[PDB]
Structure formats: C-alpha cells, structure tokens
Design a protein around this ligand. Structure first.
Ligand SMILES: c1ccc(CNc2ncnc3[nH]cnc23)cc1
Ligand SMILES: c1ccc(CNc2ncnc3[nH]cnc23)cc1
Lengths: 268, 263
C-alpha cells in the first residue's frame, strides 16, 4: 500500500498493457497482409488463369496449410458477386441454390448476392451462403468494393460459434478495372470478396491467456468508432477489477472507418 | 561529463535496439511469405495433377505480392533434377541447364537445381543450376535435410554484385513420410524455393532514411563462427558501442547488430 511502490505498480500496468496492444495490432496486421495475398491468389489462379487452377479442394488445402500465416483468423472464404439476372445460370452451373445465412434456406429474390464458392474447412458451413444476407457482412462488402481496401465490421456474434468477433473483407476485381478508378467503376469491375473471421472471443483469449502475468490483469478492447456508443470487442466489462487505476493503450487495426482502444486494470 | 554521458548512452541503446527490431521484423515477414510460396508450389505444381502452375502464373503472382517480401530482391523456384533425368528435362523445357558463373552448358553432375520459375526481377536466374554456386549449393542441401528455411553467409549476389544473404526453403513430394529421417527427406525432395536478401541496397534503404543516421555507425555481423565474424552490413572497420540482438530464424547461423557514435 506504499507510495513510490504505486508509481511502479502503474509503471508495470503501462508496460504490460502497451505490450499486449502491440502484440494484438501486429498479429492482426500480419493476418490482413496474408488475406490480401489470398485475394491476389484468387485473382491470378482462378480468374486470370485459363482454365482456373482453384476448385474447392484446392482452396481448402492451400488455406489449411497456410493457417499459421493468419493467426487471429478462425477461417477464410471467397464469395463471388452474382447479380439477379445471372442467378439461375450460376445455380445450375454449381448445382446448388444460394442460401440465406440466418436459416440456410433458399434465398429470396435480391438485386445481387455474394454466395461463398470456396471455403477453408474450418468455416465450411459458409459454403453457398449469401454473405449479403447478414447486415454486418453486407455493409463490409459494399465498403470493400467501393474503397478498394480491406475493411472491418463492428463486433458481432459469428455464425455457428456465436463467438464475439469482427469480419475482415477484401475486394477482388476483374481485369477490366480502369487505372485510377472511380467508385462507380470499382463496383462495375467487382468479381467478389475474400473474407476472414477474426474470432476475437476465442483467439484473443488464447493469445492473452498464455502470457505471464495474465491472472493479475484485466484486458478489455473497445470499438470507439462512435464516441458516444462504445462497443465491447473483447472482455467481460461487468467483471470486477481495480477501479482506482487504469491505462489506455492505442490500437490501429488499419481501417480508417473504425477506431479501437485497449483498457487494462489490475484485478484488485 | 556526466549526466549528459548517461543520456548519450540511453539514446544509443534506444536507436540501435529500434533499428535491430525493424530489421528482424522485416526479415521475419519475408521469411514467412517465402514459406507460403513454398506451400503454393507444393500445392499447385505437385499435389494437383496435371500441374496447375507455370512461369507466366508464377511471375504474375510474385510480382503482385512483391510488397509482402521487403528486403528480398526476388524469388525463384528451382526443381531437383538427377542426372538420368537431364535429357528428358531439357527436352521438356526446351533449354539446357547452365552454370551460374559463365552461363555455359553444365558439365555432367550427379544432380542439379535448375531454376524453372522466376520473378521477373530475377529473370537472369532461369535455367541456372543453383548447385553451381557454393553458397546456394550448401543452402539447398541443408534446406532439404532439415526441412526448414536456411540462410547463407554474406556473399555477393549475381548480376548486381550486391552483398547479401540467400534464403532457401525445401519443397517435397507428397510421398514424404511423417517424422521423416534425413534420408527420407532427400528422397522426397522436389525442389527449392529461394530468394535473395539484398542487404547492401535494401537494408541501406531501410536504415539510411532514419533520423539520426548521420550520428551513428551501424554494423550487422554474421557471428556463426565467433572467431571469424563476417560483415553483413556496414564498413570494414575493425570505445562506446552497443550490441543489439538479431535472430533471423536459422539456428545454424548467428547474427548481431553493433552501433557506435562517430566522435
Ligand atoms: C466473404 C466471404 C467470407 C466472409 C467472412 N465472414 C464470416 N466468416 C465466418 N463467419 C461468419 N459469420 C458471419 N460472417 C462471417 C466475408 C465475405
Ligand atoms: C533456388 C532458387 C533461387 C535461390 C536464390 N538464390 C539467388 N537469388 C538471387 N541472386 C542470387 N545470386 C546468387 N544466388 C542467388 C535459391 C534456391
């Protein structure tokens, strides 16, 4: 309970929190970069190559063998853009119907869809699901294709596991995409979307739980995109912790549309 | 003297340590992306039949992903070819296996590692037997016997003559047994995925743009043989220094960064 010992108590909190934030940010960055590579893989080996080198078996094998490259992701998949005019054709060729994510039921008529055609086996239940039939995923698809860049959702409970996480989506464009394209041109040139699920609830707990001093510290991560409406991304905020001291560590997950932060406290 | 001396030491440690972290991190990112390319060649060239990868495709994919491999000047894939197979191999590729030093047709050897796929930045490697250079040859043998990424000593690279280090990963056939012996690894070897760390240019680019670069002297040494340190980066010069840790991921090799003030 001494002074000066409590200067050091805070010094250790600051160092522990800052290190955890740097680890989370670095590992997410590594994962985004490898998802970018997979988007380029689909472009080069599925679209550009005549004939395609990628079937479901191939995508499953390659993604399984490279899972270690994407540490915070529970799975990756590729969804192809399908406009309604094309839907009957697409379904006949694939020998399956486009399904809704809420029920796995045949999709109602929509202007367009994003059905998963390739999946890592860890997320095999995504196959044939229209990723535009979930609101988080729909919004991410639109912003991915309009901006040309990787985008993140708000935190929400993922399919099957119901774990609290965030989704990462990258656009894949046709070779007809003009140089210095307008948004309207990006949309017209969209082939599909390469997505991954950051299972924060399971995988961030696994990362943090293996670190020395974990039992001493409470770690929470927030999506603070809207200042007046912070959203829990990781942690049990209700859980009892030391109310007298906290530290805020910076996080940058790389999507300028979203903002995040980590807050650490001692248990008692 | 003297509180100012303390601050001067603290600045040196901080400057050197950050540079060391930046270099280790960039190396690590490149090593990891090279490992992914090794897996890509295995999946697309060997596991799929017929092969679903070729030079055009490898060149496009590696060009588009060059950003994933900082400090690498280029990547190439060399296939293992034993002498009995040479005639068939050369007929299939419509070219002759060449020596690295003169580009002359290779004399007969027990085996060869001719480059079949290359990033266009290292297009001059195509058809060269990578076993015809002693640093690359040793790297290839150790990659295939250990099953893991390996690094060379610093040496001067082809074409540019830049001082650098080569990274080599083995690629195996799916006939590789589980928990293989070294003999089983050799037997199951398909080829070698390599890249060149151009230290002289690309590490200079990384470190030389940094603030305070003019106030310090930075060296990186390969200290695999403690009695014969080899310069990887810096000048040939033999009080106040600081040693910062580097780990480039190959247990066969050891490295360190040393930083010093000028005056
Ligand atoms: C395209 C393909 C895949 C994805 C990734 N989303 C996703 N992945 C896994 N689990 C889910 N539950 C809700 N959304 C997801 C996004 C776009
Ligand atoms: C297989 C394929 C490519 C490599 C990489 N070597 C290499 N790459 C580039 N330049 C060099 N000059 C001397 N050696 C090399 C190693 C194994």
């Amino acid at each position: 309970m001494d002074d000066a010992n409590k200067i050091r108590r805070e010094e250790v909190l600051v160092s522990m929190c800052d290190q955890r934030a740097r680890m989370l940010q670095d590992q997410f960055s590594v994962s985004v970069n490898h998802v970018h590579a997979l988007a380029i893989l689909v472009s080069t080996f599925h679209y550009h190559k005549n004939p395609s080198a990628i079937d479901q078996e191939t995508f499953a094998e390659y993604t399984a063998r490279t899972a270690f490259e994407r540490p915070l992701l529970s799975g990756v998949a590729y969804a192809e853009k399908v406009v309604n005019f094309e839907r009957e054709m697409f379904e006949r060729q694939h020998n399956w119907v486009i399904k809704t994510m809420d029920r796995g039921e045949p999709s109602p008529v929509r202007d367009e869809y994003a059905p998963v055609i390739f999946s890592q086996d860890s997320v095999s239940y995504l196959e044939s699901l229209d990723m535009m039939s979930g609101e988080e995923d729909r919004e991410n698809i639109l912003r991915a294709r309009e901006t040309g860049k990787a985008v993140l959702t708000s935190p929400f409970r993922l399919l099957e596991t119901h774990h609290l996480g965030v989704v990462l989506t990258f656009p894949v464009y046709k070779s007809s995409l003009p140089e210095n394209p307008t948004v309207e041109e990006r949309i017209a040139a969209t082939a599909g979307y390469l997505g991954g699920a950051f299972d924060v609830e399971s995988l961030v707990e696994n990362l943090l739980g293996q670190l020395a001093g974990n039992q001493a510290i409470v770690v929470h991560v927030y999506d603070i995109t809207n200042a007046s409406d912070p959203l829990v991304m990781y942690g049990n905020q209700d859980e009892e912790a030391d109310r007298s001291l906290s530290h805020e560590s910076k996080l940058d997950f790389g999507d300028p549309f979203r903002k995040h932060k980590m807050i650490c406290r001692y248990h008692q």
